[PDB]
Amino acid sequence: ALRFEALYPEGMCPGWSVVVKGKTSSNTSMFEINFLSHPGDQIAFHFNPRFASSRIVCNSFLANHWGKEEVNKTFPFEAKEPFQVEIYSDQDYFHIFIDENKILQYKHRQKQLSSITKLQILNDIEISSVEITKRG
Amino acid sequence: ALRFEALYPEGMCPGWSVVVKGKTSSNTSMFEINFLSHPGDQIAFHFNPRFASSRIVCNSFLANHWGKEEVNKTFPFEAKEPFQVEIYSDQDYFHIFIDENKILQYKHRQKQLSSITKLQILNDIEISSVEITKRGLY
Numbered sequence A: 001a002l003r004f005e006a007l008y009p010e011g012m013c014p015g016w017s018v019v020v021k022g023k024t025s026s027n028t029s030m031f032e033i034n035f036l037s038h039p040g041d042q043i044a045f046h047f048n049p050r051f052a053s054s055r056i057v058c059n060s061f062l063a064n065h066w067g068k069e070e071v072n073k074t075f076p077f078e079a080k081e082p083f084q085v086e087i088y089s090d091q092d093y094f095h096i097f098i099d100e101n102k103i104l105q106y107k108h109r110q111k112q113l114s115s116i117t118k119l120q121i122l123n124d125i126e127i128s129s130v131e132i133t134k135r136g
Numbered sequence B: 001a002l003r004f005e006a007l008y009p010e011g012m013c014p015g016w017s018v019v020v021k022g023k024t025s026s027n028t029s030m031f032e033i034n035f036l037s038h039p040g041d042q043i044a045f046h047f048n049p050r051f052a053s054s055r056i057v058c059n060s061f062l063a064n065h066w067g068k069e070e071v072n073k074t075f076p077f078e079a080k081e082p083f084q085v086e087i088y089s090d091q092d093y094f095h096i097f098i099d100e101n102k103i104l105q106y107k108h109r110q111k112q113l114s115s116i117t118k119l120q121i122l123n124d125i126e127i128s129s130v131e132i133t134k135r136g137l138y
């Protein structure tokens, strides 16, 4: 289910930090954080921690197809333990920090960054906070 | 126009803090922060600083009409200067803090607090940050 959605028509990429605090119920759950662009809610960046397998899967859903998966080895989450995920974008990458440590970066595939206007948080995450801040 | 909108289907009231940082582009415009109920966007709480007349107007839009206005006539904004608005609700009121000082409270008119799932920020404000955070239990 959709847990949280935000829309910022002026564009929240690049130069914005999104900080999500919360926790996940079981060690077989998953949640996702999506950055979506107009028109047609294409997913510029899909961040998907899968607790069943302890993998973070990142990808993009553009022109109605998932692209090449980028899977991160390290899994700094624990079921039912509060976490903090920060996603920050510059002109080249989305940068992911978890509990303040740099975890991965994801090269822009959707290159029209100003069209990225929507944030979606889905599935197994009990959100305690969402912060969307311009960092430059 | 719409500057920012957030949806939290589990309900933003009571007990959630919304902190908005930013500034106006003009000297004589206005902006608003609305809390809307699901479904159908009745406005449970409308927060409307008006910079031309230097007044903060609060009201609710239930059943397709505005209710009695509640006007502050204290106006701790100035145009083109960064401000911080914090809006919080408990079981009884919306609480409004501006730049860390309590400015006003507004008694709930929309009594179904759990239906309030949507936040909307309109017109003349250049947003630098929005933070939506649970107070109390989490």
Ligand SMILES: OC[C@H]1O[C@@H](O[C@H]2[C@H](O)[C@@H](O)[C@@H](O)O[C@@H]2CO)[C@H](O)[C@@H](O)[C@H]1O
Residues within 6 Å of the ligand: A046, A048, A057, A058, A059, A066, A069
């Ligand atoms: O690539 C992100 C999407 O993956 C989809 O699941 C993949 C799965 O990772 C892969 O192992 C294989 O089974 O093909 C699936 C394609 O459906 C998810 O369904 C989707 O939500 C994204 O996370």
Ligand SMILES: OC[C@H]1O[C@@H](O[C@H]2[C@H](O)[C@@H](O)[C@@H](O)O[C@@H]2CO)[C@H](O)[C@@H](O)[C@H]1O
Residues within 6 Å of the ligand: B046, B048, B057, B058, B059, B066, B069
């Ligand atoms: O009460 C909130 C709404 O006020 C509307 O304007 C009022 C105005 O403030 C009042 O003094 C009188 O003139 O009647 C109007 C009712 O339409 C705004 O149009 C609306 O945006 C709300 O702010």
